[PDB]
Amino acid sequence: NDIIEESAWEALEKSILYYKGRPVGTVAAFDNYDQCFVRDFVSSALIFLIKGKTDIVRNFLEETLKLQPKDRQLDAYKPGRGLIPASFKVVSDNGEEYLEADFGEHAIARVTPVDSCLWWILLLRAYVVASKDFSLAYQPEFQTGIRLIMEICLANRFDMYPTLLVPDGACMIDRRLGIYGHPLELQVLFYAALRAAREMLICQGNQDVVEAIDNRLPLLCAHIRQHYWIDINRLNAIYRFVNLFNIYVDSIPYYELDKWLPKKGGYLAGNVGPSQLDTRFFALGNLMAIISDLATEEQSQAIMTLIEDRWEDLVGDMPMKICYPALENEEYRIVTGCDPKNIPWSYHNAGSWPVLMWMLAAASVKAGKPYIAGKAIEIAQARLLEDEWPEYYDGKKGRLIGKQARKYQTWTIAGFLLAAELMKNPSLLSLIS
Amino acid sequence: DIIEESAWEALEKSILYYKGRPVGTVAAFDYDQCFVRDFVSSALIFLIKGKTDIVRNFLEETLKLQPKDRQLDAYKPGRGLIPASFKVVSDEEYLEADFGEHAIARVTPVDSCLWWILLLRAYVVASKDFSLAYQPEFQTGIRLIMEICLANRFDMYPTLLVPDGACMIDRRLGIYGHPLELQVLFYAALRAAREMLICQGNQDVVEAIDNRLPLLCAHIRQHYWIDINRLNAIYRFLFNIYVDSIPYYELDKWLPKKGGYLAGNVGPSQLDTRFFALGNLMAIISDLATEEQSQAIMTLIEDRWEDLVGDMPMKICYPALENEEYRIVTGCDPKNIPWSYHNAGSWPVLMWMLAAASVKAGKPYIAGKAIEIAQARLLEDEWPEYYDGKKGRLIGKQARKYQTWTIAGFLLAAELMKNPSLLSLIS
Numbered sequence: 001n002d003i004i005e006e007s008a009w010e011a012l013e014k015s016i017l018y019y020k021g022r023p024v025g026t027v028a029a030f031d032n033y034d035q036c037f038v039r040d041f042v043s044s045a046l047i048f049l050i051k052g053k054t055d056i057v058r059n060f061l062e063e064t065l066k067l068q069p070k071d072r073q074l075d076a077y078k079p080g081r082g083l084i085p086a087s088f089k090v091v092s093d094n095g096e097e098y099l100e101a102d103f104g105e106h107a108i109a110r111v112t113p114v115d116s117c118l119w120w121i122l123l124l125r126a127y128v129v130a131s132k133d134f135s136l137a138y139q140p141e142f143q144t145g146i147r148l149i150m151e152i153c154l155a156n157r158f159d160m161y162p163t164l165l166v167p168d169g170a171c172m173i174d175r176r177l178g179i180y181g182h183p184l185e186l187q188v189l190f191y192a193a194l195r196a197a198r199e200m201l202i203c204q205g206n207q208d209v210v211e212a213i214d215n216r217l218p219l220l221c222a223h224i225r226q227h228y229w230i231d232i233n234r235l236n237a238i239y240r241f242v243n244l245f246n247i248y249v250d251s252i253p254y255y256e257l258d259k260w261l262p263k264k265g266g267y268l269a270g271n272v273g274p275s276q277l278d279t280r281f282f283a284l285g286n287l288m289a290i291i292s293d294l295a296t297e298e299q300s301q302a303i304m305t306l307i308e309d310r311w312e313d314l315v316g317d318m319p320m321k322i323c324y325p326a327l328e329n330e331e332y333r334i335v336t337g338c339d340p341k342n343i344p345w346s347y348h349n350a351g352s353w354p355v356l357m358w359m360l361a362a363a364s365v366k367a368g369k370p371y372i373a374g375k376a377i378e379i380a381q382a383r384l385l386e387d388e389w390p391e392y393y394d395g396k397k398g399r400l401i402g403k404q405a406r407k408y409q410t411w412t413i414a415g416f417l418l419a420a421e422l423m424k425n426p427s428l429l430s431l432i433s
Numbered sequence: 434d435i436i437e438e439s440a441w442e443a444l445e446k447s448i449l450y451y452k453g454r455p456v457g458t459v460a461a462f463d464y465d466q467c468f469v470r471d472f473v474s475s476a477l478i479f480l481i482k483g484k485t486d487i488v489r490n491f492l493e494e495t496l497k498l499q500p501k502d503r504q505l506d507a508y509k510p511g512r513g514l515i516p517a518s519f520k521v522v523s524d525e526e527y528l529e530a531d532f533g534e535h536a537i538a539r540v541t542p543v544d545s546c547l548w549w550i551l552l553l554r555a556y557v558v559a560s561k562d563f564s565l566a567y568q569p570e571f572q573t574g575i576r577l578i579m580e581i582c583l584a585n586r587f588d589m590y591p592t593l594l595v596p597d598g599a600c601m602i603d604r605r606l607g608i609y610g611h612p613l614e615l616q617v618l619f620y621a622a623l624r625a626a627r628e629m630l631i632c633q634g635n636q637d638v639v640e641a642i643d644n645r646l647p648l649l650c651a652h653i654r655q656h657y658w659i660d661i662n663r664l665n666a667i668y669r670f671l672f673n674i675y676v677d678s679i680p681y682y683e684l685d686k687w688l689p690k691k692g693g694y695l696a697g698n699v700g701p702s703q704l705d706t707r708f709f710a711l712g713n714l715m716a717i718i719s720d721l722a723t724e725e726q727s728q729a730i731m732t733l734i735e736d737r738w739e740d741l742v743g744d745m746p747m748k749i750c751y752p753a754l755e756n757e758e759y760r761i762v763t764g765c766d767p768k769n770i771p772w773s774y775h776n777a778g779s780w781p782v783l784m785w786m787l788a789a790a791s792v793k794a795g796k797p798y799i800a801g802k803a804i805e806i807a808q809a810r811l812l813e814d815e816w817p818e819y820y821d822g823k824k825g826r827l828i829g830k831q832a833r834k835y836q837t838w839t840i841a842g843f844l845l846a847a848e849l850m851k852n853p854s855l856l857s858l859i860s
Contacts, residue, residue, distance in 0.1 A: 073584065073585050074580070074584055075585075075641060075644055076585070076589060076591035076648050077590075080587060104589070108673070109700070112587050152586065154505040155512075156504050156510070158514070158595055158599055160507060160510065160539045160541065161507060161539050165596055167594055176703060216505075216507065246537055246766070248764055248765040251764040273538075273597070274538035274764075275604065275764030275766045330758070333678055334757075335761070337703050338675040339673075
């Protein structure tokens with residue numbers, strides 16, 4: 001453990017990205033050489049905070065805050081007000097270095113990922129909790145940063161549900177995977193960010209947004225707990241017909257689900273909308289739901305029971321599946337548009353992503369069953385060092401190194417380290433919840 | 434003819450009164466409920482006959498129901514939206530708006546506010562007077578609608594991003610994303626708003642409209658266009674449309690050599706190759722479609738007349754979603770079974786747009802052909818809401834009778850055929 005953790009730690013320090021001589025983040029994969037992704041930095045940030053290296057996190061938060069658009073945007077191909085970029089890079093071409101933000105303006109899909117701004121709020125809270133000082137968050141520029149994020153997420157456009165309406169590929173999954181609408185990942189991160197925002201926002205001068213947050217929280221909590229929850233009992237209720245959503249039983253694979261679900265198993269659905277229930281299991285959403293207390297205690301234990309009982313499906317030989325099961329055949333053709341990268345059990349389409357192990361650890365510790373994550377650590381340890389920390393794995397059991405997976409993927413390294421740290425010291429959950 | 438005579442009688446009976454003033458028309462008579470999209474056809478008739486007061490009243494009263502402030506709470510309408518419908522609460526009288534706050538889908542359809550802008554323009558054009566539009570409350574009204582539509586959220590394309598069921602089709606039919614109908618109406622509404630907005634004080638919005646129009650037009654014209662050339666391109670292997678993802682062999686056989694149409698939707702790894710009538714017709718009418726494109730669309734409608742018009746003009750979209758695709762895309766909503774309702778059902782109301790587009794395109798005999806087909810059945814069937822089946826042979830499975838926009842759509846098709854200059858009201 002010590003030897004592998006030290007090898008991982010040495011890799012992590014090499015990934016540090018510098019701006020004006022200061023550390024401002026970590027690169028996605030050490031070998032662009034000057035690029036930092038917000039979602040990727042989370043695992044790095046948390047490790048650095050645990051080791052008392054808070055300055056890099058402060059610098060990241062300060063610089064990313066400056067990249068946030070402050071004003072309403074009415075022109076096409078420009079980022080929405082209050083959003084946080086997916087990534088930034090240090091441009092040193094001109095004599096003076098500066099940061100260049102990417103909001104997806106020239107990405108294959110011209111969509112600004114929503115998860116980045118929500119992670120940004122959680123990292124701000126992590127920083128002030130680690131520092132035992134809310135001073136940074138209380139600075140007017142940071143109060144504004146938080147408010148703008150909450151405003152864009154809270155504000156109803158056409159959809160009036162308490163959930164956040166988004167286009168497809170608007171989070172960690174950034175290609176077409178049928179996660180348009182109300183995908184779990186973003187609902188859970190929205191809920192988590194709402195909690196953090198409420199904890200950091202000064203009410204004076206923020207009355208309207210603080211009020212809206214206070215009303216949205218319990219509503220969204222109840223909404224997700226009621227309408228997203230899948231267990232054997234829910235399947236029976238859908239089958240036997242009032243309700244908020246009309247969900248028709250013919251649209252779901254209910255005999256396959258009944259067979260898959262253990263008696264005391266259950267999970268939060270991938271998506272819920274009018275005439276729409278995505279019964280895929282999504283790992284990030286389900287694990288963060290446990291960590292954020294979004295799932296009830298009973299729901300949290302049902303998720304753990306599912307993971308334990310269907311270990312081979314959900315973990316296999318590499319923790320863990322981003323989602324389950326794979327979209328296949330006609331479903332694959334319709335939902336992904338025959339995306340060749342997301343063939344069954346590859347990449348986003350039920351590929352295996354080592355980074356998720358830190359959330360598995362956090363959730364397992366939170367649920368009082370740390371041995372679940374210990375089992376996953378043992379498996380990951382056996383391959384990640386050998387394979388030099390790949391970005392992801394492919395196949396039904398995650399046996400194959402990802403076809404386009406980068407080596408020395410930083411959130412694989414940090415995710416592994418973070419998992420080990422959360423096991424040693426459960427009290428560190430306070431950083432992320 | 435008794436059919437035209439009966440149509441006029443019904444349209445009169447459909448009028449909805451508020452405080453003794455006509456404020457719109459009911460959806461179907463048999464009930465105190467005026468839908469914004471339904472009223473367009475009626476309003477255009479009333480404008481054409483010089484009965485402009487009802488339209489003025491509709492516009493004034495609906496403007497009052499529009500939310501003026503930003504809304505951060507759930508289950509309340511977004512700022513600047515027009516409700517799908519309103520009703521008179523007789524129990525003094527007051528107007529009660531419906532934005533979908535308690536509907537089966539808690540989504541405010543976007544088409545209503547776009548039609549509202551087009552109606553406001555239709556009114557000022559028919560009146561030969563822009564007075565009502567230049568009033569401050571109306572200037573605000575137009576501004577708010579443009580703001581909610583223009584303001585980028587997560588999606589940065591010039592097109593409007595929406596949930597599923599966000600237009601005339603207000604149930605789950607795989608029209609989430611950038612559905613044609615709303616892009617075409619958005620384009621037309623942008624053009625209309627520019628004509629009616631006073632540049633002084635509204636500079637940010639007017640500049641934004643000017644920036645968006647050519648970007649939106651170019652985007653739709655390039656990326657939504659489907660013809661044989663594009664089908665071959667996909668077969669050869671920007672949005673990465675893969676041949677396996679579309680019914681290529683159906684489409685290759687179906688499309689006439691000189692035929693073409695604007696796709697139902699476009700996004701990364703996504704091309705909805707269904708033909709949507711409202712979007713394609715309004716694109717011709719607004720000149721969003723190029724002249725060549727407009728002729729290619731008309732050639733398609735002529736050559737595949739049996740598929741697209743059949744025994745009742747006309748298909749809301751084509752073809753139907755069936756089998757596993759139906760289950761995956763619609764979630765097995767029993768009202769949208771194949772060739773019924775939104776799922777490639779036949780909607781009489783659409784004939785007024787077929788008429789308008791046909792006249793615009795210089796092929797008015799199409800309009801005549803459609804009116805002839807409709808005349809044979811609509812009166813005997815008592816003006817049904819919609820028809821079902823591959824050829825539109827069945828009265829709609831749950832279709833209401835005396836559907837007002839079936840009646841108004843019928844009459845408006847003839848009026849536009851009689852006087853092609855009336856296209857100024859809608860373009």
